[PDB]
From Swiss-Prot:
Protein name, entry field: Beta/gamma crystallin domain-containing protein 1
Domain Beta/gamma crystallin 'Greek key', first and last residues per copy: 8-44, 45-87
Domain of life: Eukaryota
Gene: CRYBG1
Role summary: May function as suppressor of malignant melanoma. It may exert its effects through interactions with the cytoskeleton.
Family, per entry: Belongs to the beta/gamma-crystallin family.
Upper taxonomic lineage: Eukaryota, Metazoa, Chordata, Craniata, Vertebrata
């Protein structure tokens, strides 16, 4: 039906892409032990991170790029993502 540029997100427990790391190619609902994430890495489409489970609560999207810290992403100092939603952003049609 709809296909194009692949998408994926790379989360890192510690800032500067350090410490623990977790990548998600498909839409996630629960994070590994709700492991906090200070830095992330978007690649191919945007990604929404909800502090609540089942994509509930507040949502914070992320453009394509490299986020060394949270500030740059916008998220407040002390946010914990529980669910993820891969955004195909662009679509051929």
């Amino acid at each position: 039906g709809s296909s194009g540029s692949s998408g994926q997100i790379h989360l890192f427990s510690e800032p500067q892409f350090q410490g623990h790391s977790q990548s998600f190619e498909e839409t996630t609902s629960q994070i590994d032990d709700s492991f906090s994430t200070k830095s992330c890495r978007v690649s191919g489409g945007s990604w929404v991170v909800y502090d609540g489970e089942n994509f509930t609560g507040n949502q914070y999207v992320l453009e394509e790029g490299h986020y060394p810290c949270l500030s740059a992403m916008g998220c407040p100092p002390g946010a914990t993502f529980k669910s993820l939603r891969f955004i195909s952003g662009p679509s051929s049609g």
